């Protein structure tokens, strides 16, 4: 498969999440995603084919993971945007107030602005701390997906936020949306991963 931020993958043939970013570690191919998407050794599929397995994860407290891939996977420095993409250029963190977009298999590519940092999400499974908030909407299935500026600076991976009874927060105003991401650089640093850039 072509490994692109925002695309669907399944976990154990049972749940769906979204790719965060293509990464490497030496000769091992991988992608980063959210920790609640899977436990270690769970099987990831794209297009119905096994692509790899979860290598490591932290959830709750943090909400991060990476999936180690078979060598046949094709890593791209890209985040899906409808029928095109944004190229991943780097990982410079954006400030509160700055425009940011996110990508995922339920809501597709959504844009808004960064509205807080250091937010705790009190999920039923446990608190997740240190999250950055934006007002782009999102919904269930989007988790793990890329957050990235239009200039290609990768920000983090979708964690969650104030999903409504319909499974998303697209049906409320942007001023009420809490769409939370796990910052990327601490994920790359804990796991010793290099972000694939173009």
């Amino acid at each position: 498969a072509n490994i692109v931020g925002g695309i669907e993958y399944s976990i154990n043939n049972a749940s769906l999440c979204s790719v965060g970013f293509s990464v490497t570690r030496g000769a091992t191919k991988g992608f980063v995603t959210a920790g609640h998407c899977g436990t270690v050794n769970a099987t990831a599929r794209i297009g119905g084919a096994v692509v790899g397995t979860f290598a490591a994860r932290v959830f709750p407290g943090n909400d991060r993971a990476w999936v180690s891939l078979t060598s046949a996977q094709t890593l791209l420095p890209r985040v899906a945007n409808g029928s095109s993409f944004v190229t991943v250029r780097g990982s410079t963190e954006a400030a509160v107030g700055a425009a940011v977009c996110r990508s995922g298999r339920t809501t597709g590519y959504q844009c808004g602005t960064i509205t807080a940092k250091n937010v705790t999400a009190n999920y039923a499974e446990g608190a997740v701390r240190g999250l950055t908030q934006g007002n782009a909407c999102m919904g269930r299935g989007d988790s793990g997906g890329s957050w990235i500026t239009s200039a290609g600076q990768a920000q983090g991976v979708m964690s969650g936020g104030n999903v409504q009874s319909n499974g998303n927060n697209c049906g409320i105003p942007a001023s009420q949306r809490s769409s939370l991401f796990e910052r990327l650089q601490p994920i790359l640093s804990q796991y010793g991963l290099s972000l694939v850039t173009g």
């Binding site: 959210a34 609640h36 909400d63 995922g104 339920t106 999400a121 009190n122 999920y123 039923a124 499974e125 999102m138 919904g139 269930r140 299935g141 989007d142 988790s143 979708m158 964690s159 969650g160 936020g161 104030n162 999903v163 809490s178 939370l180």
Partner: peptide
């Protein structure tokens, strides 16, 4: 809040 809930995970997505």
């Amino acid at each position: 809040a809930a995970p997505x």
